[PDB]
Symmetry: D3
Subunit: 150 residues, 6 copies
């Protein structure tokens, strides 16, 4: 619509590296509205339900261990085309091949340490949102700048 | 002392102007650790307890009315002297009198729209953390860059 | 040549969003020289002469109404390949498909609210320049850093 | 008071060092509104009236000679206490004595090359706006983020 | 490996333009470790050995004259895929065709004045490193953040 | 006076936290010229001479032990009043008491981890430059933006 939402998670590395404010600000600058925000230490269950599509990927184990190893900053951003757009702002999986100006392109080197998670579709955003936030955690009242939308 | 915590709140005006990342980043850069973080629309009750000291003052009402009017991003940072330091980083009540480089100095013009709330003392930080955050919402084991403290 | 000029206009949204300084600075950083600069509220005539190529596009009406709805910051930048280069710095029409690091890519979401106008050719730059600035408004004396040009 | 205006001038040195965006952005960020903006090479006459208070001083000549030597970016910002605030944001006469975070503190080293001019009072701002700007060059209806003032 | 190194040189222009801190910081942000750093005025011999592959290119003479015309900030950065990655962060030869967010894309206009040199392969990095630094100038002790590498 | 020089050292903590570019940039922006720059792991002997004034103090040992523990980025900047100015830009001994906008104010929390060393006087700058730098490592002919000094 224009009320599309995405699930973004600043991974433990990213939190550790003090990149939280920097990530949020990129999205705030873009004109996306923060409709949900929290810091938590993901549980094994959440992590596994989160990355369930990767269940049989050789890095799963490590992935799940790492995401649960420290605080994660989870958030939901709402705005027109926010899913595909947050995905672009992030870069690609490998932070080395990520274009400069992208979050990963500017701050990571290693795949295992690629700082942020972003939902890759409306479907998965919807699913991840529900997984990480209770609807009472999410705003109903959205108001970005009127200067953003026609 | 390295464990000291402060209660910081990005007010509805800070949130609508898109200064959340920007603010977190400042504290992140300073070396303070994020032990608690969430976005919520405060409650008249929270709002009133939170501003209890000002109940006999003329702006009390506006204060409470304002705070409850939109999303707030509440957070607690931990670190050596964080209470006094975050105050200095914020500026003074009046943004116009607040020095450039401070949060208020840099982004605010009006007292009732001074973007952020910072605990003014350990006692108050302690009271305010409790008030706004559930124990399970705060990190227990905090890991700050080891380059920060001796 | 190397004395090529382009017409850039920070649209009402962009002005409203306080992105003026930020846009200028990108161009100053790049090494382009500001040879003309002003803030004005475009008239219907200017707007229509400006976007005349779009006269029969379904959004014309809206375009013209919006550009005239508030202050515009018009400017001319001079430098080698400034037209094509300012165009790259801007992104594409849709700020959503605009690469991160581009003005539109970093700050817009909506096409109707894509913050800046940049001439798309030497021809059109020449025409827009003449349309928006009297030659007395334009510098004759250009001096970028000697550190920029061989 | 919310309507108060100040006269700011980015001097020839500020302009050549590419600090125009950078400076506008600071004021933009503060929440001040841009009611007047233009680039011009000052006139000896303008220059002298503008610096009239210093005509009996030794540096008067240099001052006028300097100001008239290249492009200046003149602007008027409106907002509550903007005159005093923009002064604070600028620093003191001597850049070296100006605190980090201020314009002079951050970018200047020498008094005769102190980048910017800011009106020191309402009377002076009023005199200087008139002097440098044509009434039709200033906005009449100013719209500041509504998140700025109570 | 992950201990790969690259030779980066901030050219005289770039030094002149005060872009040194800005370049370094991009690399520090990325997570690369500075294992060697110095400011020197390259000699004709160094310059020619450096750009030996270009010996018969029409710009060689000019290239060599320019690199020797002022201080160069030479440095070595270590990290996974640092060669290809530093090359991406730089842009392409022509700063005009360089993507926004890239060093050249953000700061240059002219090919002759494209601010930085980056080795283009492991081979050439190895060779340039040895050419510009004595092994006593290079760290042996590498420690980037553990937050960077899996 | 325009020729004045200062000794600045980015300490092992400044270096590990990736604040080298960030720090150089500040000084670069101010208009100070980089006359000497290198990365080295200090020597107990250097370290002790350098901190000679504090040999009768309790933290002397820690100081020397700390300094020698990792890479330091030593640099000398030249410019009018640079000694006093760079001090102001650094903050006070205690980062927590250092004002926002200053280096310590912005990035440090602890006295023993206060990121940078700046010469406190001409005599000391002169002594410290000599100590840390070889004459041939310092520029002889310094060219500062001509927009900086009158
Ligand atoms: N080859 C790998 N080795 C280690 N971790 C990996 C690898 N591939 C992916 N990952 C991790 O798995 C996460 C999920 O993988 P993927 O869906 O492919 O990435 P993305 O986050 O780009 O969508 C990545 O962000 C990263 O944290
Ligand atoms: N006189 C006033 N008028 C309007 N709002 C006020 C006034 N005094 C305080 N406030 C508001 O209420 C808050 C009250 O806290 P106070 O202790 O006075 O300030 P601070 O936040 O700097 O500690 C202020 O930050 C501001 O939002
Ligand atoms: N489909 C659209 N809906 C609304 N506004 C549009 C649309 N397409 C273009 N615009 C507006 O018209 C301006 C001119 O259009 P166009 O030439 O295609 O864009 P550009 O500014 O990228 O060159 C755009 O910048 C935008 O402000
Ligand atoms: N003693 C001086 N030497 C050189 N230039 C000076 C001197 N005093 C003032 N100036 C210059 O003229 C301006 C005069 O205005 P003044 O009221 O003294 O300072 P300010 O701009 O801070 O209000 C200064 O900003 C500076 O450019
Ligand atoms: N056509 C040219 N005119 C002038 N200088 C050039 C030209 N092509 C290259 N250079 C200079 O030669 C350097 C080496 O050239 P090249 O290997 O092609 O560039 P790069 O630095 O992108 O690898 C460039 O960075 C630039 O400083
Ligand atoms: N009381 C202390 N405890 C720990 N470290 C200290 C103490 N006093 C000084 N230092 C350390 O040694 C340096 C000594 O220099 P000093 O003259 O006291 O400070 P400054 O660096 O601000 O000039 C400090 O910057 C800091 O790293
Ligand atoms: Mg994926
Ligand atoms: Mg077009
Ligand atoms: Mg090459």
């Amino acid at each position: 619509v224009n009320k599309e939402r995405t699930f973004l998670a600043v991974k433990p590395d990213g939190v550790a590296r003090g990149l939280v404010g920097e990530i949020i600000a990129r999205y705030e600058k873009k004109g996306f509205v923060l409709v949900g925000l929290k810091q938590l230490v993901p549980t094994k269950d959440l992590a596994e339900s989160h990355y369930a599509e990767h269940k049989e990927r050789p890095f799963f184990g490590g992935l799940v261990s790492f995401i649960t190893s420290g605080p994660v900053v989870a958030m939901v951003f709402e705005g027109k085309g926010v899913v595909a757009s947050a995905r672009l702002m992030i870069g690609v999986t490998n932070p080395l091949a990520s274009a400069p100006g992208s979050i990963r392109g500017d701050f990571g080197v290693d795949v295992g340490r690629n700082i942020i998670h972003g939902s890759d579709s409306v479907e998965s955003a919807n699913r991840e949102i529900a997984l990480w936030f209770k609807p009472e955690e999410l705003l109903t009242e959205v108001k970005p700048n009127p200067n953003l939308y026609e």
